[PDB]
């Protein structure tokens, strides 16, 4: 019976704290306090294949987890108290107690970072023995130690973070084992390849990951950091990632004579939630005999329940897992949106075929 992660380590901060934080960040970056300063990517379409040939790009595995900005500052209440806050795109602030970030070449160990805004993702790695480890992967930096690098390019944005934050953290980590083992998570820089290193991610990086994955991310290294939707930031996903939740109904045809043989394969009808109580027939869920005997091996009710399905390479929906939590299937709007996402976007093949050209075009515009 297939069914079903990571969560923010901190605890929700009080309103009179998050308002002060919002104001402080707003004054630092020069944006609206309630407006999320982070960036959001766009769907990778065909027109981007040309884009990768006209600009320098960085590609990295798009891990699945919680995207949230990290903020090193002083506690809103107490005057001098080093504090770290994680906040998502919905502006929900979480105070991460029990964590610090060493300053470069700090003999005393009392120095701490302020006005430091990092852009990263929260993932959950699986180590040998089933032992889990929460991790924070940094892929950008909006501000560091009081300086706003949003006007700068990616190499400098990651460079300053590498020098003033990551390196002292590693230096501290390699000497202090037990101290590091108390951290709510391990902060590390995300492994990134060149825009044409796609293949390397497919055959080496991704299959050796310790956490989940859904597609790739292309980050332009020739563009400044942009709050909100970024045209240079591209999110690519193969067809199998676009999953839709349907209502499953097993239709056993009425036999010519005798009682219905349920051992025989029925029609797996998938329905979409339209109204509030009204569903509508959408498509069929393809199941072969091995998979059918597999379904009867669960010995659970199959009909009348939510299921998660994906489009295979043959453009037919296959069973993935049950959705015991979902009250209703995906609304017709969501279904339409996903169908549009599948209709658009570049295939893995047509994306790979363009790599040798992107590589040479990159080495061609290269600075001597």
């Amino acid at each position: 019976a297939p069914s079903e992660e990571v969560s923010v380590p901190g605890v929700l901060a009080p309103r009179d704290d998050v308002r002060v934080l919002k104001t402080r960040i707003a004054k630092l970056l020069g944006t609206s306090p309630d407006t999320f300063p982070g960036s959001q990517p766009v769907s990778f379409s065909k027109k981007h294949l040309q884009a990768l040939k006209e600009k320098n790009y960085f590609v990295c595995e798009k891990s699945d987890g919680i995207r949230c900005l990290l903020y090193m500052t002083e506690h809103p209440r107490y005057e001098n108290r080093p504090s770290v806050y994680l906040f998502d795109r919905k502006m929900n602030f979480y105070h991460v107690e029990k964590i610090f970030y060493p300053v470069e070449n700090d003999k005393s160990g009392k120095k701490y970072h302020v006005d430091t805004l990092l852009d990263g993702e929260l993932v959950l790695d699986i180590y040998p023995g089933g032992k889990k480890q929460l991790r924070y992967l940094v892929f950008d930096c909006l501000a560091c130690d009081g300086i706003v690098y949003m006007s700068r390019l990616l190499d400098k944005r990651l460079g300053i973070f590498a020098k003033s934050i990551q390196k002292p953290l590693d230096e501290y980590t390699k000497t202090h084992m037990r101290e590091t083992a108390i951290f709510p998570f391990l902060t590390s820089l995300k492994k990134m390849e060149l825009g044409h290193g796609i293949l390397k991610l497919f055959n080496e990086v991704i299959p050796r990951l310790r956490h989940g994955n859904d597609g790739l991310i292309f980050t332009c290294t020739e563009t400044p950091y942009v709050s909100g939707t970024d045209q240079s930031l591209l999110k690519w996903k193969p067809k199998e990632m676009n999953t839709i939740d349907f209502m499953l109904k097993l239709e056993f045809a009425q036999p010519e004579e005798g009682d219905i043989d349920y051992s025989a394969m029925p029609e797996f009808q998938l329905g979409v939630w339209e109204g509030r109580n009204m569903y509508s027939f959408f498509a069929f869920m393809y199941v072969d005999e091995k998979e059918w005997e597999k379904l009867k091996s669960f010995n659970v009710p199959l009909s009348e329940r939510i299921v998660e399905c994906y489009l295979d390479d043959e453009n037919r929906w296959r069973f993935l897992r049950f959705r015991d939590d979902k009250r209703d299937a995906n609304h017709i709007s969501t279904v339409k949106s996903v169908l549009q996402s599948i209709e658009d976007g570049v295939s893995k093949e047509d994306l790979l075929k363009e790599m040798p050209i992107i590589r040479e075009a990159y080495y061609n515009r290269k600075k001597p």
């Binding site: 339209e274 009204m278 569903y279 509508s280 027939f281 959408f282």
Partner: peptide, 4 residues
């Protein structure tokens, strides 16, 4: 037993 549904629409469409």
């Amino acid at each position: 037993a549904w629409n469409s």
